Design a protein around this ligand. Structure first.
Ligand SMILES: Nc1nc2c(ncn2[C@@H]2O[C@H](COP(=O)(O)OP(=O)(O)OP(=O)(O)O)[C@@H](O)[C@H]2O)c(=O)[nH]1
Ligand SMILES: [Mg+2]
Length: 664
């Protein structure tokens, strides 16, 4: 029932994705690679002392700090939600094979009993109202670019100067490209302006994943991760197979001479997609202004910073429901892309821009290396973009596409199961906008705090409260999906954007507090996703620019966890046993070295200026800028720090571009 076309690297369609330069040619051909990450300078993830440390620590902490999660998934007591065995992976060595990305998610959605469009007129008005509220009265801002990020297809440049030139040229030629696409001239738009082609698939590590200890055998068991073979991916699951990837690490001894202790596994690998930068630049020029609007006007629902910022909102609720979405990106509906595009057109957005936006969400995908002897295949024909992959991770507005889908999905759930008395407030477009604008500001008796697939749903006192409790009960039972749009359940140990909601004996939001997740501190410190990249001279271009700095923000981030001191002492004791060294002293030296190095990058910082002016967010972001992609935003970071990590295209060029896109 319609298989996606697939082309080998040798085919002209795939060759046209890679420019005649070394980096682009190497990206096309790069074979499956694996190896121990440099966890910290001079320390490999597979160092026997380090693995001994992880074995002792994971065992000790699980033993002394068992999970304290009630029947309703509320975390209490010690603030622990699971075992500490997630650290037991051979970081840098992936599970084999990684998945082939599904070319079409239509069958996947239909088989999961999810809708192929808005179910009712109300829902149609609410999704359209979300577009109207989000894309409205936008103010131009400079187009900010992450330092060291790739331009991907076709140039594969990491040079800031080249990236600035590409973005400026893209804003100049986006109209001409979009008009070519409106005429079905995708090849011309790509050939002339590099707008089109495909997403470049890279496989990224999820460094920690579920591991359990079988009491009967005393053997560890890793969580099975289902992967699609090539046949399954091109047929949207009609043919081929979906099977468990192998996390068995025994192979490392034979292949690499690495001693593998018992109960240590290969890492979970996730697909990540890099977009063609010339196509993303015009999209990002609108996406950043949208973020600024939603994080300002709709800050209640959308702008999340500290544990206290979150706590102030939640404390006022009579009921707090922490939801979970199954595989958000792969289930994300193409009908939403079409609805968004249709509404933008109705608002008066430039048709050429809407076509670029639509095209970015139908684009083919170039598969690199999921396993040895596999990959190097283009899925979909770039001459006529028609894929249904769900949400591509490298699309210029992915966060906004997930936020738009989910914010409405949760409101619909609250309407359907708890507040039918509010349905009369949604009669047409003006009333749908008025209602949504009030709801997003936290002015209704039904509330939410969300970001993409993470949310907390609230009820104050009122008519909807009783329904709220029935919905929570329905979730606990887990027999009926409460949504026609996505697979929704409750989170087993409710947390929001990394902070655990710690309840007391009362099990009420009013007396509950947000605390940092101690397990995330452990994940970040002992299982980083990337190595230190010691060979990359420019630290601002590394995946972990200043790792040592995280020690300075630790107490601020994690200090409120009931077991904070206990964990730090357990670390010290175990590190002493494994290395014969003080972990605290080791981290204090790393903090000193990184603080000194940082002044080289900050113009306001003198040769030995300390971290006095820096916030804990600034420090966490400098140690892990990936937190800027899922946890925080540009506005949450000090201005002098933002400039270390990003560079921008002038507001003059974006202002002129934006004027041509927008209705008014
Ligand atoms: N802990 C962690 N998660 C990440 C990171 N980068 C991306 N994620 C994503 O966050 C999700 C993992 O959830 P968890 O490890 O259980 O905890 P969390 O996302 O950090 O926070 P909560 O969902 O509020 O519980 C996946 O969808 C990941 O792809 C990272 O650096 N650290
Ligand atoms: Mg959650």
């Amino acid at each position: 029932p319609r298989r996606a076309p697939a082309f080998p690297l040798s085919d002209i369609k795939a060759q046209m994705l890679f420019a005649n330069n070394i980096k682009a040619q190497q990206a096309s051909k790069r074979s499956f690679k694996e190896g121990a990450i440099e966890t910290y300078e001079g320390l490999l993830s597979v160092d026997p002392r380090f693995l001994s440390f992880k074995n002792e620590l994971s065992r000790y902490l699980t033993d002394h700090f068992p999970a304290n999660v009630d029947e309703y998934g509320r975390v209490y007591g010690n603030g622990v939600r699971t075992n500490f065995f997630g650290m037991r992976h051979m970081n840098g060595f992936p599970m084999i094979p990684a998945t082939w990305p599904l070319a079409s998610n239509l069958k996947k959605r239909a088989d999961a009993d999810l809708a192929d469009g808005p179910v009712s007129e109300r829902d149609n008005l609410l999704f359209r109202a979300a577009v109207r509220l989000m894309f409205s009265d936008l103010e131009p801002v400079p187009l900010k670019i992450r330092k060291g990020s790739s331009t991907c297809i076709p140039y594969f440049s990491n040079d800031m100067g080249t990236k600035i030139e590409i973005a400026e040229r893209a804003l100049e030629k986006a109209e001409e490209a979009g008009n070519l696409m409106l005429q079905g001239k995708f090849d011309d738009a790509y050939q002339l302006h590099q707008m089109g082609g495909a997403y470049y698939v890279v496989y990224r590590a999820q460094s920690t994943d579920a591991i359990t200890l079988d009491p009967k055998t005393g053997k560890f068991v890793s969580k099975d991760r289902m992967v699609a073979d090539f046949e399954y991916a091109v047929t949207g699951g009609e043919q081929g197979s979906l099977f468990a990837a192998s996390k068995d690490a025994s192979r490392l001894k034979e292949q690499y001479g690495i001693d593998v202790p018992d109960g240590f596994f290969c890492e979970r690998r996730r697909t990540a997609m890099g977009g063609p930068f010339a196509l993303n630049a015009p999209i990002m020029a609108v996406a950043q202004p949208v973020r600024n609007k939603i994080y300002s006007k709709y800050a209640y629902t959308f702008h999340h910073t500290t544990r206290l910022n979150k706590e102030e909102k939640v404390k006022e609720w009579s009921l707090c429901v922490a939801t979970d979405v199954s595989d958000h990106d792969t289930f994300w509906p193409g009908w939403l892309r079409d609805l968004i595009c249709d509404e933008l057109l109705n608002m008066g957005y430039a048709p050429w821009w809407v076509k670029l936006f639509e095209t970015s969400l139908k684009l083919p995908v170039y598969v690199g290396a999921p396993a040895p002897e596999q990959g190097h295949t283009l899925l979909g024909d770039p001459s006529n973009p028609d894929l249904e992959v769900g949400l591509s991770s490298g699309q210029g507005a992915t966060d906004l596409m997930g936020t738009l889908l989910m914010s409405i999905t949760y409101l619909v759930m609250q309407l359907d199961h708890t507040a039918p008395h509010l349905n009369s407030r949604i009669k047409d477009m003006p009333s749908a906008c008025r209602f949504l604008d009030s709801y997003w500001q936290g002015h209704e008796e039904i509330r939410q705090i969300s970001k993409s697939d993470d949310a907390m749903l609230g009820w104050t006192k009122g008519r909807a409260l009783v329904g709220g409790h029935r919905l929570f009960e329905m979730l606990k039972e887990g027999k009926v999906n409460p949504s026609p749009y996505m697979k929704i359940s409750y989170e087993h140990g409710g947390a929001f954007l990394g902070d655990i909601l710690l309840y007391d004996s009362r099990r009420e939001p009013g007396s509950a507090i947000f605390v940092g997740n101690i397990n995330s501190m452990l994940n970040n410190q002992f299982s980083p996703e990337y190595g230190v990249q010691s060979g990359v001279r420019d630290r601002s271009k590394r995946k972990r620019p200043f790792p040592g700095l995280a020690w300075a923000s630790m107490k601020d981030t994690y200090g409120a966890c009931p077991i904070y001191s206990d964990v730090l002492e357990a670390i010290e004791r175990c590190w002493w046993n494994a290395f014969g060294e003080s972990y605290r002293a080791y981290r204090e030296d790393m903090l000193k070295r990184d603080t000194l190095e940082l002044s080289r990058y900050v113009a306001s910082m003198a040769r030995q200026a300390g971290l006095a002016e820096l916030t804990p967010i600034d420090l966490e972001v400098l140690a892990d800028p990936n937190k800027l992609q899922y946890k925080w935003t540009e506005a949450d970071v000090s201005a002098n720090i933002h400039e270390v990590l990003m560079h921008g295209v002038s507001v003059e060029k974006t202002e002129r571009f934006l004027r041509s896109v927008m209705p008014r």
